[PDB]
Design a protein around this ligand. Structure first.
Ligand SMILES: [Ca+2]
Ligand SMILES: [Cu+2]
Length: 639
């Protein structure tokens, strides 16, 4: 069950128009307030004209519109449920612009919502592009439009939110498919529920940024309900998804063939563990007592080439536990893991105590000191975020989280940890003056220019309650050691929400909820367009282009040569991301030091240490003197 961001606009004076209406199922039966009457397009004697069908509302005055909702017919007949759809707003009823929301609604009879940033408008149009089962018709028992209490124009310079992407599931986990550019998402055995799973099934959905298409696919071949998993992209270019609702399983998502492949069971049953890809392309995981039982779950390691997991019992979980009020059940969850040099994995929190993990022999763990600064020792920060914004200098930015997983006040703590060699205690300092808004359950991504975007969360973590929401994102800019608030959004993104960097340099931020018939399921996502894509008039800036690359698969240590259609000042590599439960151990950034060959031709070296340039897929971005990034070119990095 979902909910709208607004309050329903009274419909007494509306005029509505539909492409067709069966008599008895007139256009205005969708706004008579009777749930047992519906609008329905032509069928029968009138022929069965096919979608797109269109429902247009003239609301007579300008309202501060922030959603609409559609109640399907309730007579047990599925005909005319809306699948693909687009929502447009207009002030003259003639010029509609770009959709403020689009995507697909799940095929059943529950009320569907489109939630989007407030926009003043007098006319609203819903286009039903497909029917949910492929049939000719559209029907709707009640359509409502919602408004916010006010409207404030976004401020120049601080980015923009929108459009909304409407989805058939809550995307509580997601990954970019690097070879196609699509956003892959999944929930669990149900579109919005995880409890009582019979195991064996994951609902997935994908959004294609370049066609805007949302599709879906029910995955049973890996016999894995993947809610609550570790996620890493391995050196063979496959995404390893572990445990969760089926605590022993491994599923492999292969972006090239766009398919799922069974992997070998883990040695230990786990849920809510973090896994991290290693400098040799293998994947390490540790902890995870959400499923498979509560007990000490020390490290293990997955080998893509031999397809085995092997236990590393001396990579001990004890040193990284938090003091969670709930004990080991929570206290070994969501470690801030980063693969680093020579097979090591750094654990940056959420526990105060940071640790080196080693994966030779049966494993090892070594204290790396406490996360702290001149302001004191940092407390446990369960579901705080950690992001490696400069792998070449070992820089990790950490921020937010709370001492307990849930029912717990979040903080504005933030640190910069600087990694050196494995086994040495890194320098950690406070980042700037901390976050503007205390938050937990927020998500974050490093952006092409090295800044880190931070969004959503709530001030006090109370899972599934969209209370104390934080609507204003922050960006940390490391060269200034400063945070900057960005334009706010209107959809709560708290527990079970995700963010990822898209190839076109925008941020995709969605989910939140996945709690059954709770009222806080967000079956959607929105795009955030950072300010670096706008010129100083607030139009989209012209972006440099990479017109050639000399290779798109390179070995650590190797050079790449590019041509561009114009001069570039900076370049960076950003490793593709994956995301669930605040955790993303896949993204990281490498700033590139460019050789200018002349004529808009440049080279750079991929760092030769593959604990820095972790093997897998990376995005190459180049930025012009104005700071505008290109869209990414995909580079596979090997070792
Ligand atoms: Ca009705
Ligand atoms: Cu969860």
């Amino acid at each position: 069950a979902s909910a709208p961001i607004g309050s329903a606009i009274p419909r007494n004076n509306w005029a509505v128009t539909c492409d067709s209406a069966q008599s008895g199922n007139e256009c205005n039966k969708a706004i008579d307030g009777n749930k047992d009457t519906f609008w329905h397009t032509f069928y029968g004697a009138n022929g069965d004209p096919k979608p797109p069908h269109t429902y247009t509302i003239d609301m007579k005055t300008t309202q501060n519109v922030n959603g609409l909702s559609v109640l399907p017919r309730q007579d047990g007949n599925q005909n005319g449920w809306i699948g693909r759809h687009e929502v447009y707003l207009s002030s003259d009823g003639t010029n509609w612009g770009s959709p403020v929301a689009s995507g697909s609604w799940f095929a059943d009879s529950t009320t569907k919502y489109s939630n989007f940033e407030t926009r003043p408008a007098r006319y609203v149009r819903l286009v039903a592009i497909t029917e949910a089962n492929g049939q000719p018709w559209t029907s709707i028992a009640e359509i409502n439009v919602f408004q916010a209490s006010s409207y404030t124009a976004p401020q120049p310079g601080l980015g923009r939110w929108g459009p909304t992407i409407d989805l058939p599931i809550v995307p509580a986990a997601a990954a970019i498919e690097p070879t196609s550019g699509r956003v892959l998402m999944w929930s669990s055995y149900r579109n919005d529920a995880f409890e009582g799973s019979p195991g064996g099934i994951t609902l997935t959905s994908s959004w294609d940024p370049s066609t805007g298409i949302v599709s879906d696919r029910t995955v049973t071949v890996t016999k894995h309900d993947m809610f609550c998993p570790g996620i890493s992209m391995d050196g063979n270019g496959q995404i390893v998804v572990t445990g969760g609702n089926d605590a022993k399983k491994t599923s492999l998502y292969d972006s090239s063939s766009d398919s799922w492949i069974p992997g070998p069971d883990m040695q230990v049953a786990r849920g809510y563990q973090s896994s991290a890809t290693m400098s040799d392309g293998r994947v390490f995981t540790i902890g995870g007592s959400f499923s498979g039982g509560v007990f000490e779950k020390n490290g293990e390691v997955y080998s893509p080439s031999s397809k085995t997991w092997t236990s590393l019992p001396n990579a001990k979980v004890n040193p990284m536990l938090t003091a969670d009020k709930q004990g080991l059940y929570k206290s070994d969850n969501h470690a801030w893991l980063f693969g680093w040099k020579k097979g090591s994995v750094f654990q940056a929190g959420p526990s105060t105590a940071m640790n080196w993990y080693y994966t030779s022999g049966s494993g090892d763990v070594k204290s790396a000191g406490k996360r702290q600064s001149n302001r004191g020792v940092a407390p446990d920060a369960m579901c705080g975020n950690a992001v490696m914004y400069d792998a070449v200098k070992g820089k990790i930015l950490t921020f937010g989280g709370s001492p307990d997983y849930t029912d717990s006040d979040a903080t504005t703590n933030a640190h910069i940890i600087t990694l050196g060699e494995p086994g040495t205690s890194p320098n950690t300092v406070f980042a700037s003056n901390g976050l503007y808004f205390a938050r937990t359950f927020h998500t974050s991504v490093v952006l092409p220019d090295g800044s880190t975007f931070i969004t959503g969360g709530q001030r006090r973590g109370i899972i599934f309650e969209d209370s104390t929401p934080v609507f204003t994102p922050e960006i940390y800019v490391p060269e200034q050691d400063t945070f900057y608030k960005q334009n706010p959004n209107s959809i709560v993104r708290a527990y079970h929400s995700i963010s990822l960097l898209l190839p076109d340099g925008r941020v995709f931020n969605g989910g939140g909820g996945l709690c059954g018939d709770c009222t806080t399921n967000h079956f959607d996502a929105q795009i955030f367009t950072p300010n670096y894509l706008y010129d100083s008039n607030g139009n989209l800036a012209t972006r440099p282009k990479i017109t050639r690359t000399s290779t798109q698969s390179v070995k650590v240590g190797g050079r790449i040569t590019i041509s561009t259609d114009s001069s570039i000042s900076k370049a960076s590599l950003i490793r593709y991301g994956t995301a669930t439960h605040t955790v993303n151990t896949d993204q990281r950034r490498i700033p590139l030091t460019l050789t200018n060959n002349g004529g808009n031709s440049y080279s750079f070296q991929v760092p030769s240490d593959s604990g820095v340039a972790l093997p897998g897929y990376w995005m190459l971005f180049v930025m012009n003197s104005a700071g505008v990034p290109s869209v990414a070119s995909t580079i596979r990095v090997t070792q």
